[PDB]
Symmetry: C3
Subunit: 340 residues, 3 copies
Amino acid sequence: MITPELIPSPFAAQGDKDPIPQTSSTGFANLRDGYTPDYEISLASNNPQAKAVERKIQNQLFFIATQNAQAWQRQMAPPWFQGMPGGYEQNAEVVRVGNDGIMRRYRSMVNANASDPLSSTTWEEQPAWSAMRSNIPMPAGGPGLSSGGEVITTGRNFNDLLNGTWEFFSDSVVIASQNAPVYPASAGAAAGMLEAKSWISGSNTFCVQRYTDRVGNVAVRGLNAGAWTNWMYAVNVMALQQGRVTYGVAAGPANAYTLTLVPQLQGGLVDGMILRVKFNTMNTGASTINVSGLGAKAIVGAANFPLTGGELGQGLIAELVFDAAGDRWRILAGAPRIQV
Amino acid sequence: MITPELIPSPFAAQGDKDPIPQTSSTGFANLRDGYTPDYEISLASNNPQAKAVERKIQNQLFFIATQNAQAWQRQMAPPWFQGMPGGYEQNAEVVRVGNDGIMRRYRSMVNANASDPLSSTTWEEQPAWSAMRSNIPMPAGGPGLSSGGEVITTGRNFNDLLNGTWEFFSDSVVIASQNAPVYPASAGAAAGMLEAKSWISGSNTFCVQRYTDRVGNVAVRGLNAGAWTNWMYAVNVMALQQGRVTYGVAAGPANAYTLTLVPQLQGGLVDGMILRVKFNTMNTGASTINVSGLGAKAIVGAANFPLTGGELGQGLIAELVFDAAGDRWRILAGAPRIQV
Amino acid sequence: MITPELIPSPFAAQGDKDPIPQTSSTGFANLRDGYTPDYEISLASNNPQAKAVERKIQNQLFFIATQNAQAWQRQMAPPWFQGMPGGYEQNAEVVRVGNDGIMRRYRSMVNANASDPLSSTTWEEQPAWSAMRSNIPMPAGGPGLSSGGEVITTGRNFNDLLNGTWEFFSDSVVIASQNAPVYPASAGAAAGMLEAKSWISGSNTFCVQRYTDRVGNVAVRGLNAGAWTNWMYAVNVMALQQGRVTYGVAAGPANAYTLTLVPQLQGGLVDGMILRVKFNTMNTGASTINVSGLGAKAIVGAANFPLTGGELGQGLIAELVFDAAGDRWRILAGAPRIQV
């Protein structure tokens, strides 16, 4: 850390200057010999090549040194010079006037790189750090440029979660998060990341966010017309093996032997929902049971007879299904077609 | 821009240059004082301390500047130097050329560290933008340096995707794009992003295609040998409660009942597959039942009464499955049998 | 390779120096004109403009050159010169003194940016690849900084790898390696990508690891207390379509039946859980069935009492349910009824 002085203009910027050659003829300046020793010789002594210190050469030498320092201060990188002799070793970094005069860092991939970086595929153009933060499909910590915030101490609420790897740090604190992405019968989300991405179709915004919690359920929700739809939670093979969706314990006191459905039918009931209905006591008769708390259907027999006698009994599991036209509990197992 | 035109070579770098000492007790051109006041005495004074201006020092002075300038021009970063006084400050970078010969830029991750950058963990190697863009395993828009192409412009085949995720700003683009899957409880994909990550094991481009919509319906597949495999869709909880895929309604020809299912039934004939069917009419004779038109086979139950009539009550589902090797439907659930 | 020897201290560091005048009316070593033509007349002629080369002017010139060169050699880059003529053009990464004490590189993005790097949004950092990659949840090579190591042809240990993406060049070498997922209706994991990442959680820092195989059937799992949870093989909608996962072909000897299927029914028999099991032969009386060794319970009919026989045909697939209080499995449908 040493700070040079601001070079406003190189020395002898608008002064007479002469080009310093590489080869010598007489007691003249060079670039390999520089000031010649042999014809260094007494200038006021009538000697053949007797030379004097050259104002033009020394002024241009100072001009060159000051120009290099000035360009170093401003652009931090030598401009790539057209067909410079000697070539470029690979991984060399330069910046030079681009197509528009807009310039970016260029790094060469080949030795003896004689091609101009604007015309070279070997020279690769290197933009800034925002280009990395864009190249990641979702920036860590949301729009936040720094990685800090990618893991969140308090469960990041999903009322504004649209993008970014908002990793969730403490499961207990995420239990308090609203719009919790956990399958039903679970209170709140656990620790884990959210692959969340958002893309704008004009004024409207479409986005989706997926998230695997500690337990393992994969919850993915998408914004619909400016409002997030409730998460979809992956049906795990343990979930299917449990079969909690299609069965419950028997509930309801009279003319109803409903099952408290955990989980209940999301999005209502449409056609032929199958439930292995439990009856800890014998069915009363035409039972208008409120399965899932919203589907209220009256059970009638498959033989168009009431199920009061012998069809449904106590301590029973018997699968009952909807009717599309009837919206009634037709039997799939347990209540038979009685002989008479 | 200010263009410090490249000097072909340093000044006097084949001739003579006496090194510049740090201090000179004899009052010569040192570094602490530069040109000493002794270089100001008149030489005609007959003062011995009057030092005439030598050029070996002049040549070395000009050579230092010219060589530093050309190193800046031709190799960007300063070469690392053995034992820099004070080591190197934090975030200071140099280039320590390796045995390979390529320039190896190194950043100082440790304050005031003097460790040899070639064999230093502190002197971290500064990789190329290609290295960073390859170090991200899921790059948007393939391998491009730009992050553009997040949302696909039009309906285009997902075969172009190799490794990365792409958003979808148009609900038209998801359907119109080739290889658009048949979503659960939907015609096609909603406007949600899709990931296709295919490791290029030559012709065995092992791929994963994670497709997700607004509601959270999820789908996957993978490409191989010039063709993508089937689409695996993760089951829904909302779909799991209803069981719409397993549920079905019989249709088609009389007593040769087929089925139409949303989403379409796949997998063909597999050992012991559920055939749930609202029979469109009451059977009066030889009755055959199948789902998705897989195959019309006779139904045999526990009592083994033949195809006579009433075995398939109209609209009565029956969660029956066909014998794996018998090629005949075994009634499983909801068996309506009238006495004939 | 051009390595201009280390500059320990600039020329005329603590010596006398004359700040070069920017422009001089009477030609006096000004920057605009350099050494003006009046620095060439003989001093003996006594003409008024007989200037001589000033020691302090020469000292200041060489000081500027050596100071800039040494700053480049040590800190890689010029400092941020406040009061910069014309601000800083686009892509200008000045090294800036830290308020804390670390040197920090801020790049001006906008042409002629003129605000202080610390207190401006225009200046953006260009940090090292370490803190840079910290923004990637899933870095290539996992822990490895380089892109390599992500793909291992050999069946590397699944336990030791904790973060990053793992690709296996061979699909079956995943099964050869430990902790390979067993997808439904699939022997083992196919050739897919494993995304694994570990977050701090306080006492038990936790990681999520999911393998998405080539077909797409995903296995989400969670490293619990350093021990991974068994892979969660997401059942897909065509697994629901086939119904094979829930289907079972129970061993058919009379009065004793054994039930098992892969993927395993975790938890075995559950209160009010039903399974579709094929009994090949008849059963004379109260039979037996169990899953996973939780408990073997008797098999009966709709009367819930030991069966009489004739309630099942050759190869009858039956839905057997288990209730907590009854502790019995009964042929719910497809069963003739007899009262005990």
